[PDB]
Design a protein around this ligand. Sequence first.
Ligand SMILES: CC(=O)N[C@H]1[C@H](O[C@@H]2[C@@H](O)[C@@H](O)O[C@H](CO)[C@@H]2O)O[C@H](CO)[C@@H](O[C@@H]2O[C@H](CO)[C@H](O)[C@H](O)[C@H]2O)[C@@H]1O[C@@H]1O[C@@H](C)[C@@H](O)[C@@H](O)[C@@H]1O
Ligand SMILES: CC(=O)N[C@H]1[C@H](O[C@@H]2[C@@H](O)[C@@H](O)O[C@H](CO)[C@@H]2O)O[C@H](CO)[C@@H](O[C@@H]2O[C@H](CO)[C@H](O)[C@H](O)[C@H]2O)[C@@H]1O[C@@H]1O[C@@H](C)[C@@H](O)[C@@H](O)[C@@H]1O
Ligand SMILES: CC(=O)N[C@H]1[C@H](O[C@@H]2[C@@H](O)[C@@H](O)O[C@H](CO)[C@@H]2O)O[C@H](CO)[C@@H](O[C@@H]2O[C@H](CO)[C@H](O)[C@H](O)[C@H]2O)[C@@H]1O[C@@H]1O[C@@H](C)[C@@H](O)[C@@H](O)[C@@H]1O
Ligand SMILES: CC(=O)N[C@@H]1[C@@H](O[C@@H]2O[C@@H](C)[C@@H](O)[C@@H](O)[C@@H]2O)[C@H](O)[C@@H](CO)O[C@H]1O
Ligand SMILES: CC(=O)N[C@@H]1[C@@H](O[C@@H]2O[C@@H](C)[C@@H](O)[C@@H](O)[C@@H]2O)[C@H](O)[C@@H](CO)O[C@H]1O
Ligand SMILES: CC(=O)N[C@@H]1[C@@H](O[C@@H]2O[C@@H](C)[C@@H](O)[C@@H](O)[C@@H]2O)[C@H](O)[C@@H](CO)O[C@H]1O
Ligand SMILES: [Cl-]
Ligand SMILES: [Cl-]
Ligand SMILES: [Cl-]
Ligand code: NA
Ligand code: NA
Ligand code: NA
Ligand code: NA
Ligand code: NA
Ligand code: NA
Ligand code: NA
Ligand code: NA
Ligand code: NA
Lengths: 89, 89, 89
Amino acid sequence: SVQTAATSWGTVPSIRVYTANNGKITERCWDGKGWYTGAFNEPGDNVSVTSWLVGSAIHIRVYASTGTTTTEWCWDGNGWTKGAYTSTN
Amino acid sequence: SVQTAATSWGTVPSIRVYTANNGKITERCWDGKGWYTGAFNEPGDNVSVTSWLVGSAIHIRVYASTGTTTTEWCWDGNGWTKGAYTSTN
Amino acid sequence: SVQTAATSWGTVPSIRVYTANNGKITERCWDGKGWYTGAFNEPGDNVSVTSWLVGSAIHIRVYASTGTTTTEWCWDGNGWTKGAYTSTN
Ligand SMILES: CC(=O)N[C@H]1[C@H](O[C@@H]2[C@@H](O)[C@@H](O)O[C@H](CO)[C@@H]2O)O[C@H](CO)[C@@H](O[C@@H]2O[C@H](CO)[C@H](O)[C@H](O)[C@H]2O)[C@@H]1O[C@@H]1O[C@@H](C)[C@@H](O)[C@@H](O)[C@@H]1O
Ligand SMILES: CC(=O)N[C@H]1[C@H](O[C@@H]2[C@@H](O)[C@@H](O)O[C@H](CO)[C@@H]2O)O[C@H](CO)[C@@H](O[C@@H]2O[C@H](CO)[C@H](O)[C@H](O)[C@H]2O)[C@@H]1O[C@@H]1O[C@@H](C)[C@@H](O)[C@@H](O)[C@@H]1O
Ligand SMILES: CC(=O)N[C@H]1[C@H](O[C@@H]2[C@@H](O)[C@@H](O)O[C@H](CO)[C@@H]2O)O[C@H](CO)[C@@H](O[C@@H]2O[C@H](CO)[C@H](O)[C@H](O)[C@H]2O)[C@@H]1O[C@@H]1O[C@@H](C)[C@@H](O)[C@@H](O)[C@@H]1O
Ligand SMILES: CC(=O)N[C@@H]1[C@@H](O[C@@H]2O[C@@H](C)[C@@H](O)[C@@H](O)[C@@H]2O)[C@H](O)[C@@H](CO)O[C@H]1O
Ligand SMILES: CC(=O)N[C@@H]1[C@@H](O[C@@H]2O[C@@H](C)[C@@H](O)[C@@H](O)[C@@H]2O)[C@H](O)[C@@H](CO)O[C@H]1O
Ligand SMILES: CC(=O)N[C@@H]1[C@@H](O[C@@H]2O[C@@H](C)[C@@H](O)[C@@H](O)[C@@H]2O)[C@H](O)[C@@H](CO)O[C@H]1O
Ligand SMILES: [Cl-]
Ligand SMILES: [Cl-]
Ligand SMILES: [Cl-]
Ligand code: NA
Ligand code: NA
Ligand code: NA
Ligand code: NA
Ligand code: NA
Ligand code: NA
Ligand code: NA
Ligand code: NA
Ligand code: NA
């Protein structure tokens, strides 16, 4: 099966659902008006997510794994950027 | 292995744990007094979840996947209902 | 692939990422200053997580599964303790 991860914020709410399928992760988005495909598209076979609001600004962290490798991706209001996470050391 | 997804709300807290096993997803619940089996029972091989409170009312979204198909299930205070989510388009 | 689960709290934030690899789950931690390996180390092939704050005290629940067995682990300010969760009955 594909593998998903979901997060939400606020009371509208906004929702993001990440799906790993055949080695790629894609993103679907709800902001109160319908579902649309988001900008996030990166390699991975497994995905997890968390998020937090600072006032009205959302911060999202997506953990994309393949084999024994995990890469963190970061949204902080502009774009997706690889983060500093490593699984060890 | 079975695959689980967990969410919580409030400070009691309430917890819900969803488990995919042999193509079915079941639900376990804590509201401060012990664990009990919940009403949610739907097909799926993979599960994710998120939730949010509006005041004192919980909203839960369970994303149930099998193969390349994902179905969203919705709790909004009464019962479980299929949602509008699709993985594409 | 390894399988991960992530939670966060506050606005710093703190983040915890749990990774199941080859039958063991390990923990990585961010509290604003860098990533470090946490104290959590228990058997499991699949992991989920949730957490909640009571004021300034974090409570974390990690659901560690192997085959059809799921064990809950609990952090409530001191250490990791097996919880009362069972998947049925
Ligand atoms: C992608 C990344 O590494 N983000 C870091 C951030 O990097 C800075 C760069 O963005 C740029 O400004 O150059 C400086 C060096 O001069 C840094 O490399 O630095 C932040 C400062 O601590 C990191 O912390 C978070 O920053 C967020 C906003 O960008 C936010 O304020 C958050 O609260 C901070 O903790 C940021 O780290 C990333 O986010 C944290 C939470 C972890 O997920 C970490 O692994 C990420 O890389
Ligand atoms: C199951 C579903 O589709 N729920 C929708 C909801 O559907 C309405 C029906 O419940 C009924 O009232 O008939 C009307 C048309 O006349 C709609 O079909 O409509 C809501 C309005 O936007 C959707 O939005 C959420 O509604 C929640 C309470 O029911 C809550 O207020 C939430 O804040 C709203 O965003 C609701 O969509 C479902 O929930 C959202 C968050 C997504 O998960 C979406 O995919 C779900 O279908
Ligand atoms: C590990 C565990 O079972 N924790 C229980 C907690 O057990 C108590 C023991 O810690 C000790 O004090 O002895 C008494 C009997 O005299 C109990 O066995 O009991 C708490 C009381 O309800 C449980 O509830 C949570 O306690 C947390 C702080 O420890 C916190 O206040 C939380 O809000 C309470 O709901 C605690 O249960 C564990 O946590 C809950 C949320 C579930 O995850 C449950 O399965 C856990 O075992
Ligand atoms: C903050 C926000 O909602 N931005 C929307 C745009 O990006 C989408 O949301 C962010 C948080 C991240 O999940 C992106 O990968 C995602 O595409 C979005 O493109 C736009 C739609 O027209 O709406 C913005 O509000
Ligand atoms: C709001 C709430 O806690 N409702 C409980 C009932 O349903 C359980 O919780 C909801 C949120 C959802 O997870 C259901 O699938 C689940 O069964 C529950 O049946 C009842 C137990 O007697 O207690 C209610 O409070
Ligand atoms: C509350 C807190 O942040 N405690 C830190 C110590 O434990 C780490 O965090 C807790 C919540 C749990 O995830 C542990 O398994 C984890 O190791 C930590 O060891 C210490 C680092 O020097 O810093 C504490 O603040
Ligand atoms: Cl950004
Ligand atoms: Cl409802
Ligand atoms: Cl403790
Ligand atoms: Na989630
Ligand atoms: Na649509
Ligand atoms: Na942008
Ligand atoms: Na969770
Ligand atoms: Na019990
Ligand atoms: Na009902
Ligand atoms: Na998460
Ligand atoms: Na480092
Ligand atoms: Na300690």
